[PDB]
């Protein structure tokens, strides 16, 4: 491992693995899997019904006390039956650590809102509803936060076109700003940059 | 004339009048015993539209839990008679 390779820390890896086992032991009803990355990042995959309990545990247990909610986001993977993946990032100041909690959902299944646990989640949850269409139940007020008023569709889905469906301009006949079907003077050039000759054998998949 | 009690006749006249006010119902087909579905050809949206019009003239809020059962003008007039607590 020459100076061009990122150094590896084993103590943090062992500590994160031990804490993952500890958490999975405490809450066997909700946690479905625990992982520790090669760069010392611990993630926990749980059932959708365990959003409120597990988070509360990680915020209130004397040994976890993950006080801060750093980020909350969603990932769209259309090839999955449960399309959307919700990610919570928690930071514990007392133990100087970070954790990740992952949950799955689809278009029609709602996810219980975690505003009661973390207030910071509030706007984040709205953002998800604005960008992906995931509905959060028992939210103080759920509405669009980023897109234009009356915007149809959720832009951050993988099946949403990059340029959208409508474009704005100004019309003098009606003396106002109007929306028209989108027409581009130059079409967005699509590049097939992905190449054959796989680069990482460590991630090779079985040939089914 | 000043403020006589609401007769079961005047209520019927007012209900029938505001029914004629509807643009989708012609005066030569509806009756007091007519049904909104098959004798006049309306779906639920006109029914709520009709109900809303009645509320405005009458002045009393009608809950949705029991406004779906006002299916013909007969039970409509019975409903305002019961709500206004008027006998004969």
């Amino acid at each position: 491992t020459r100076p061009t390779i990122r150094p590896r820390n084993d103590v943090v890896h062992k500590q994160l693995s031990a804490f993952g086992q500890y958490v999975a032991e405490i809450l066997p009803k909700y946690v479905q899997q625990v992982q520790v990355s090669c760069f010392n990042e611990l993630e926990i995959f749980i059932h959708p019904d365990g959003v409120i309990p597990v988070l509360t545990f990680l915020r209130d247990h004397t040994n976890a006390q993950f006080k801060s909610l750093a980020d909350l986001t969603a990932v769209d993977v259309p090839t999955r039956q449960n399309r959307f993946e919700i990610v919570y990032n928690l930071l514990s100041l007392r133990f100087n650590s970070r954790i990740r909690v992952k949950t799955y959902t689809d278009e029609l299944t709602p996810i219980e809102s975690s505003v009661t646990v973390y207030k910071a989640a509030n706007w984040y949850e709205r953002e998800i509803w604005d960008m992906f269409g995931v509905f959060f139940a028992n939210h103080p007020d759920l509405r669009r936060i980023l897109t234009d008023y009356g915007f149809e569709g959720h832009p951050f889905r993988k099946d949403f076109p990059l340029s959208g469906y409508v474009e704005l301009r100004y019309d003098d006949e009606v003396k106002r700003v109007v929306a028209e079907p989108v027409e581009l003077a130059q079409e967005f050039r699509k590049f097939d940059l992905n190449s054959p000759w796989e680069a990482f054998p460590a991630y090779r998949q079985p040939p089914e | 004339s000043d403020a006589p009690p609401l007769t079961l006749e005047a209520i019927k006249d007012r209900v029938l009048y505001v029914l004629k006010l509807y643009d989708k119902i012609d005066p030569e087909k509806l009756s007091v015993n007519s049904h909104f579905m098959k004798d006049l050809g309306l779906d639920s949206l006109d029914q709520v539209e009709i109900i809303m019009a009645m509320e405005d003239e009458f002045g009393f809020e009608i809950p949705d839990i029991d406004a779906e059962k006002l299916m013909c003008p007969q039970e409509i007039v019975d409903y305002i008679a019961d709500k206004k607590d008027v006998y004969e």
């Binding site: 008023y149 009356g150 | 539209e49 809303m52």
Partner: protein
């Protein structure tokens, strides 16, 4: 099986009731919006547009889809109440500035390759 988690309605009756309440709210609000935004349309046109937008989704037979649409409609109505939109946002529902696309085969054949 095919058991799913509800949103607001257990069956189609409750979803229909919520649709009815949303329609009542929109019907009541149309004249206030027309007066306040100083629209060029009449109340009759606004109510007709509300009816058309409601009947556009008349073929939905899933209570979850129906009450999600109800949630979206309630959000849009709330957006309209607080004057969060402007005249342009309200008037985008009518496409007064877009040319009318034809429907028959011959016109579409003449204009271009669009099927």
């Amino acid at each position: 099986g095919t058991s799913v988690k509800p949103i607001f309605s257990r069956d189609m009756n409750e979803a229909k009731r919520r649709v009815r309440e949303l329609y009542r709210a929109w019907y009541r609000e149309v004249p206030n919006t027309v007066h306040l935004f100083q629209l060029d349309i009449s109340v009759k046109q606004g109510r007709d547009k509300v009816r058309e937008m409601f009947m556009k989704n008349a073929h939905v037979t899933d209570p979850r889809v129906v009450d999600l649409l109800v949630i979206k409609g309630k959000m849009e109505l709330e957006e309209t109440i607080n004057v969060w939109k402007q005249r342009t946002h309200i008037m985008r529902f009518f496409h007064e500035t877009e040319a009318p696309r034809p429907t028959d085969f011959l016109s579409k054949f003449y204009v271009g390759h669009d099927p």
